Design a protein around this ligand. Structure first.
Ligand SMILES: Nc1ncnc2c1ncn2[C@@H]1O[C@H](COP(=O)(O)O)[C@@H](OP(=O)(O)O)[C@H]1O
Ligand code: NA
Length: 278
């Protein structure tokens, strides 16, 4: 596994987990179903968190599933070399590469968004233990590429902007990491309402408890510890790092934090105020 990028229709992808073949199949496939469910996010936004929350919702709270099966098998990524009823799938693809057949179908999509800053810190560390990804290199340089969209999947800015074009639609829910972080149980109900799958105190309360950071970091099937070191280095670090809101303040120097606001301002021009925007 090289740890290099290749490009598809102009977008950067990691060698190995992805290939021209896979991405295409995902873009141009026809297998999209009315009851299918898609989790779509930009890496390090907390996909995993959601991938679990939903798995619990599905089984009304029976941890059975999330205990027995890994996570990359409960909500399989479309674009990956090994792409996927009721089907739960996930994708990091930008709106212009995602499965087209989607747009005309009644399928459901939950876009999760995270504070761009934390997403970088989060990606920084991960890259160090990720087999498919090249090592961070100097901080600044890493931050320069992120803002420049010179990383796997391209600009975080483009991604969230493009996808948000689905806001307004009823087969599309947009939610942020911060929200789950703020009121997880609330979010759970919401994401439940969105999927036409209600739960009783018992069920909901279960999903809540089982979705918590600690809980998940405690579940082998969910903490990625079962991946082959040739993709994650267990001896070094962990996929579920801290799991908190605003760890960016402990990484960015003011200089970087300012330059970021700059780039961010000249990119999120007239976007609505996001949770994290202070
Ligand atoms: N239940 C949970 N609660 C809080 N953060 C969670 C979480 N499950 C995963 N995460 C965090 O989501 C990030 C990875 O998401 P993704 O699946 O998109 O790559 C990591 O951020 P950190 O590096 O800050 O710990 C990870 O710890
Ligand atoms: Na690496």
């Amino acid at each position: 596994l090289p740890g290099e990028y290749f490009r598809y229709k102009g977008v950067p992808f990691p060698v190995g987990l992805y290939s021209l073949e896979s991405i295409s199949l995902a873009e141009n496939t026809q297998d999209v179903r009315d009851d299918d469910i898609f989790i779509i996010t930009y890496p390090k936004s907390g996909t995993t968190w959601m991938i679990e929350i939903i798995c619990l919702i599905l089984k009304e709270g029976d941890p059975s599933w999330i205990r027995s099966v890994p996570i990359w098998e409960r909500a399989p990524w479309c674009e990956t070399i090994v792409g996927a009823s009721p089907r739960l799938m996930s994708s990091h693809l930008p709106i212009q590469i995602f499965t087209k057949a989607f747009f005309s179908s009644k399928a459901k999509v939950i876009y999760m968004g995270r504070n761009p800053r934390d997403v970088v810190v989060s990606l920084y560390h991960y890259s160090k233990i990720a087999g498919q990804l090249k090592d961070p290199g100097t901080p600044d340089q890493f931050l320069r590429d992120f803002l420049k969209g010179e990383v796997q999947f391209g600009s975080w800015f483009d991604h969230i902007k493009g996808w948000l074009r689905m806001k307004g639609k009823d087969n599309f829910l947009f939610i942020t990491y911060e929200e789950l972080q703020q009121d997880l149980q609330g979010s759970v109900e919401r994401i439940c309402g969105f999927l036409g799958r209600p739960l009783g105190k018992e069920a909901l309360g279960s999903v809540v408890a089982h979705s918590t950071f600690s809980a998940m970091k405690a579940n082998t099937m969910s903490n990625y510890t079962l991946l082959p070191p040739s993709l994650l280095d267990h001896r070094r670090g962990a996929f579920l790092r801290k799991g908190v809101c605003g760890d960016w303040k402990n990484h960015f120097t003011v200089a970087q934090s300012e330059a970021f606001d700059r780039a961010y301002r000249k990119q999120m021009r007239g976007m609505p105020t996001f949770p994290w925007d202070e």
